[PDB]
């Protein structure tokens, strides 16, 4: 019984890591949106400067 409980705990922790992966992916999406906004602003400010 003790061994079976240990196996259950290990499985759950591994699944937790798997979910952390998707969390980090969402963070990446946030940063990408920020970069896109900055790029649009610059590309916008450029021709005026010519």
């Amino acid at each position: 019984e003790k061994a079976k409980t240990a196996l259950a705990s290990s499985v759950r922790q591994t699944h937790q890591l798997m979910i952390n992966s998707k969390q980090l992916q969402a963070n990446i999406e946030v940063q990408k949106i920020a970069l896109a906004k900055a790029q649009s602003d610059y590309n916008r400010r450029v021709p005026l400067g010519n």
Partner: protein
């Protein structure tokens, strides 16, 4: 007049770029039109003085 013309050019260039609204261009055009009347009046006053 030179200064106001330069300002109108900047505002139009920014609107085209996509940083402002039509109302700003309308105000810039009004301000540029006013100085044109003032410049004409100055020449009339000069001729009247002569």
């Amino acid at each position: 007049k030179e200064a106001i013309y330069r300002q109108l050019d900047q505002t139009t260039q920014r609107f085209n770029v996509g940083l402002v609204a039509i109302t700003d261009v309308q105000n810039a055009r009004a301000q540029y039109d006013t100085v044109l009347a003032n410049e004409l009046t100055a020449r009339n006053n000069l001729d009247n003085a002569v």
